[model samples]
Target: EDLRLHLLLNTSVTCNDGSPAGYYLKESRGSRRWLLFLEGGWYCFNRENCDSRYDTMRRLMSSRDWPRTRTGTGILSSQPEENPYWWNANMVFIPYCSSDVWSGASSKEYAFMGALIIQEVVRELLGRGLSGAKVLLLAGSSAGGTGVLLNVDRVAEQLEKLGYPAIQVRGLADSGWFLDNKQYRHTDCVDTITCAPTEAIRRGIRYWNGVVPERCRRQFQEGEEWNCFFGYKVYPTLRCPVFVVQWLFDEAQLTVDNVHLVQEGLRLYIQNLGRELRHTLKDVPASFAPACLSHEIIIRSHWTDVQVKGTSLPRALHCWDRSLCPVHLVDSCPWPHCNPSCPTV
Candidate 1:
């Protein structure tokens, strides 16, 4: 049975020169609330592949048969279309800071540009009947997690500037890359090569000196200054609730050391700012563990399920091999489950 729903495919907005500016909505189903999902840097704006990722996410949400509103292709472009539903949907998804966006520029510039885009998207959504919608901004990994921490303050500032109630913002940084001044060099992985070794080195030294570089320090200070921003810091200035996920086995790829440093730094910062911070950690199996199993339990559990929203259903069986289970048995597992729950098992 086809589920009747409204979906809007919002494209990433780019500057006149084609650099990504932010995201825009195209198709939408009028709802009273909206959820905006920001992409990681690498997946933000690409002339060729921009729509591909957008389409994939759109399809995933649609597969769930949720009555939602999404945007269409080129929605971020200058040309505008008239669609009343666009002004009505209460949910929006924006996935930015895919590896690509964070590769070349200084983290400060990247953070600033990303904040601009996110601010614009939030403004647009608020104008489209989401005036009172509680906004949930989510991200994971490198820029995914960093963007939320870095841009949230600007987002709140912009909202307030527009005379809108501060958008209710919450954040989740999964195995985030919140590094101390000394660990800035650790971000070499962001570009597969050291994009700013000098800056990284300076940041590291400045941390030791109890100061931040003048250029990059502003963004970090901005985070401290804004009340809406939330994350682990040297102290505890985070004003909003924050949930941090870290895996014990998170080695060099996503090191626990980095996570700890980040957590400590945030703790210290918040204390310095005289703010209260709430933090949580989820340590999953490390690199040596079975990759599938490691992510299956930790990351997969984080994905929203009907149960998370308080829906009652039969407890899902842990079927290791789909092929071993009968088709009928699989069908009884859950909404997204089909026969052969674990075909290989």
Candidate 2:
């Protein structure tokens, strides 16, 4: 279960900084299924914010200190007990060093090359074993989760163009289905991490030289590509079948809007968030959304423990994986932290 680091040598695709972009690989012998995981982190939209991130979260912006060998966790785990469904699949951990939610394609002089990195990595993996892959599942958490939404179709198209049309491509977006709902109170778009979704993504698309899925792009008017950043906005346009795993009250989404649930009014906001989550996911082909105030599930050991009704996240993902049945698991309980299985914190 050793995961070796692989720097992208064929292309000049770097991270947010100038360091070469790369991924960690855990290849399973003779396995045609490949799970490509995108690592997640918050992003910056402008030079000042990028500088702030560069100062505090430098690792996300540069590969200056990336470990030569790293162990896979959660769904990427090689241990069958840890990742019951996809443990033995060929795994690739694509780091989110570009901080562009894997959607940017800026010039070489500028380093925001997230979308290009995925393209190059898949092509590189084609040489290694992915060309023979029968099923390719693209998955990620948070911003990386958004990345899956943004790039899954493009990846599928690339494979077809590269003569690997027979491979089945899919997406598993974990806690990445973001909402562009109202904040508890008005907060101006002053900084990077604290801004509203509209301002943040609007500025981010331009600053990062971002691109959206063509289908989603068609839905939005020009200069409104930022709308495509939201899961509810772009999910309907995706060609490949995608399994979405989201928390009803996502902590990151709450944090961005400065929603403190201690107040009575804010509790109502949380309830509304749950309602909105259920509404958007009602027609999704496959989804697992528990009414909890948590974020990110696929990488946790307790992933099998938490459930919406009788279905656990892993079980829901299994149903989607085998094409046995549709997976639409939204919690019936609307209140936050109503599930006993939810983490106690």
Candidate 3:
């Protein structure tokens, strides 16, 4: 179960601050399947805040002197029974170094060519033996999850270009589909007084201009970049199918005020997000949402234990890949934390 650590950092435009960015790999001799998980961290939003944001990631990963990093865990685990579907598969873990969700070019304040970083990582994987990958699963948690969605199409395209043997490429985002809501419900997220969700997102769009895909960028109006930055706005544009797994009450975004609302406003938000997802997501493999009140999945021991309709999370994913594309949204009981089945960060 030892993960082979790969420290690759030779880009002319280094990670945020000339630090090395790489991934962990676990080779599978019998399977051509591969799992690539993108690590995630919140955006810098502006040049001034980028320095502050940069330091935080150092604790997680970066060029800084650290004894170790939190990589190759849970879904990225080398153990088979814990993560049967992806354990033995050729697994590649891309750590989040570029703060732009692994899809930024750069900014006056920071080095964000995240998208390029991903390409480099992929290139490394290719050299390591991704030439025969018959099945590929790209995923991430939080911002990393967002990375999976934004970069999924491009990777699929790249694999095809390299002639990767009719690869069945799919995606999974763990709490990555950030909703584009005008309502500033999370009281703590605000700065001085009010919360302008649009403004916040807009600022990020500006800083992440080149990082975001040109197609997504063109859709954002001169001043309305934030609106289109949401996963709801972006997923519809994906060429391949993706499975989204999120919590009805994500503690990261949801605060105390509207804390327990499985009914009115909260319910409406989920419903709207679901409708948007069902509409845009290609292949539309369905979604697995539970009332777990947590953020990401696939890290806990019980991750495989939770299920819906007689289908565990792993079973659902295997089914989605080769069986049924079922969308399970659990707001109440029998939802397996929210019901449904599948993958995540």
Candidate 4:
């Protein structure tokens, strides 16, 4: 079946620009498996940052420019060759319109209703075969990847509350494991796009009226709730099994932290980033981390090509799905771009 846009009209859910929010769906014939993907884009914390973001990246905040019908790719792909594992499964693509990393629940300046959007979307899908689905994989990239971390448990709990106890929910987060490690050099929170990771999240939680999952929220103090947004902190608290796919040298993290490897004296920053990432992810049972300088992979056509150790991402995920065991496959090489299979920069 072809993918088509389905606008949410029943609920009060709206994007940051006050436009109706929606998701792209491709239903499979006689298949109950579902993949609900959240698209990724950076977020804005304060009014100034959001205002400028609205001007530059309006597509992320509004559905005005969305096409009526679109196609899925990578993990969302329908092609058996490309998406070996989930080709025939129902696929839903939730666009990033809230600019809150799918964590917000406010509506002051902008709607910032990311959390509401997801809850409503799942509610809507239940009426359309999802109620009988056997498996549901909540996957995302970058911010959306982080979103999967923040929202997977909530989705699973919602399903249980809604009486869909048979549907087993899992997470496949791509490049969302961002670290709160110190930046290579000092940088101010000048704009939302380039703010210090911690400060941006700190201001963002307040601005967006963000919601943290119940288990993780209890672990944080009133002022430190933003820490729950980071993958390492939130992952430990998640009730669902999540497969993390991260690059040792994530471009977005480097950009925000001002770690340009071309510049002199910045080599240590990347090296330390690798060590920190490996250390943080050391305990994660299901992950496919490659030592590459990149961000986001599930949406790319080459999703099946890149690998960690001897296993590709698709294979690793497939094994995790069946065994639900520790399929951790981090690259032994410490340096960035050491994997020859990494996509061209």
Best by lDDT: 4
Candidate 4, residues 214-315, lDDT tens digits: the string is 899899887798898889999988899999999988999898887654555677777778888888888998888899988899999988889777677888
Off by over 4 Å in 2: 324-326
* Alpha carbon lDDT at 168, candidate 4: 96
Question: What are the RMSDs of all candidates, in order?
Answer: 14.6, 1.4, 4.6, 1.4
State how far residue 137 of model 3 sits from its true place (Å): 0.9
Q: How far in Å is the alpha carbon of 278 misplaced in model 1?
A: 14
Instruction: Look at candidate 4 and tell me the lDDT of residue 330.
Output: 87
Quote model 4's TM-score.
0.97
Q: Any idea what lDDT model 2 has? A: 0.86
Instruction: Go through the candidates in order and give each one's C-alpha lDDT.
Output: 0.33, 0.86, 0.64, 0.87
Candidate 3 wrong stretches, greater than 4 Å: 55-57, 65-71, 184-197, 214-225, 255-285, 324-345
Residue-by-residue lDDT tens digits, candidate 2, 1-345: 578999998658888778888999989977899999998887788888888888898999998899998888888887888888888999899889888888897655347888999999999999998988999999999999999999999999999999999899999999889888788787888876579888889898998889899999989799989999999999988899999988888899888876754678877887787888889998897898888888888877778788887777887888888783447888878798888888763
Residue-wise C-alpha lDDT for candidate 3, range 1-345, written one tens digit per residue: 555667775546456776676667778888888888876656666665666555554644364553344445667776677887667778777767776666576533466777877787787787776777787888888877788877888888888787774877789888786654545355444431133445555666667664554566587676654544567777667677788766654554443122333547666665554444344433334666555556677555557766655556676777677751455533343222354443343
What TM-score would each prediction reach against the true structure? 0.44, 0.97, 0.80, 0.97
Instruction: Give the per-residue Cα lDDT of candidate 1 at 51.
Output: 42
Q: TM-score for model 2?
A: 0.97
Q: In model 2, what are the clashing residue pairs, if there are any?
A: none
> For model 4, what is the C-alpha lDDT against the true structure?
0.87
